């Protein structure tokens, strides 16, 4: 289901906050159906947006401490990062088109 740069509370500091470039983080959980629902879309986006965007996924199940840090109200929430600093945030399950638009508009 999920096959990308998987994150943890430990790696958050280096792999995201100290990452050189743009990173899209997907705060998900094993129980949220609409979260697993967007997994294939994120994989496809990771393929096409290669080089430009770094796609990542964080599982709140074993990594809870980071969701409150960005005021996550209810997974699936997407956090776009640009050089460690957070740009935009999308809440809920989205379509490939809506995801592309969400990314493109902020990426620039």
């Amino acid at each position: 289901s999920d096959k990308i740069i998987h994150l943890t509370d430990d790696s958050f500091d280096t792999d995201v906050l100290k990452a050189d470039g743009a990173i899209l983080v997907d705060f998900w959980a094993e129980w949220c159906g609409p979260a697993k629902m967007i997994a294939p879309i994120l994989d496809e986006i990771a393929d096409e947006y290669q080089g430009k965007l770094t796609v990542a996924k964080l599982n709140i199940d074993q990594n809870p401490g980071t969701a409150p840090k960005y005021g996550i109200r209810g997974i699936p929430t997407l956090l776009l990062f640009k050089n460690g600093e957070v740009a935009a945030t999308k809440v809920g399950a989205l379509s490939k088109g809506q995801l592309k638009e969400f990314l493109d508009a902020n990426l620039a």
């Binding site: 609409p34 997974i75 809440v91």
Partner: protein, 229 residues
Amino acid sequence: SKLDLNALNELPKVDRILALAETNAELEKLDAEGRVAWALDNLPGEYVLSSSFGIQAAVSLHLVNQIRPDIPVILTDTGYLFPETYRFIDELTDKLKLNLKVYRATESAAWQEARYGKLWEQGVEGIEKYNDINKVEPMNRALKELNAQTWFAGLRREQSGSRANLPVLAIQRGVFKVLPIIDWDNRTIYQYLQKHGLKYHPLWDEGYLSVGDTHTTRKLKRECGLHEG
């Protein structure tokens, strides 16, 4: 004091929900285990546990089965379930040691396809006739053959929809319909699965959001909740 249904069925649908409302108001404060326990002896004869064996059957099955060993678990086999679903059943029935009651149609898959054909292609009325002969009728026959007056189901207020019109207790077909894990949410179920070493349905971890039947039958508000704030 033990509830009388032969008098409850002699009451309209609203007096029923109102009279039962006073009892449900109490069941609302208890946990899933307390509701099953309360139901065990406050309600009458034959208690059955009907399951669909989907993404979260392991919860209700394990919970209710631990409470009551070798309880009549009703499985209405439509005939076209996912292969991994059957193995999930045969895996559970052996792991949880369940008194499995299988109830399929009066006719088989090939029989139905020759007699009527691919009902699912024949629109809603065809799907209705399909659901009636594959799920409804078999269940109605199961309740009677097992002589049940109480029936437990692992329904949640979350899955598709069962807002405050679906009380923990109820009367569907002259039988006390009980739903213990009703107020439970995806977190609570996931946690229950973890705490008891129970696994999710083999397909859930692939893409199938809600498995059921295969033949063009199977293929979630945009969000879930960590709790709004």
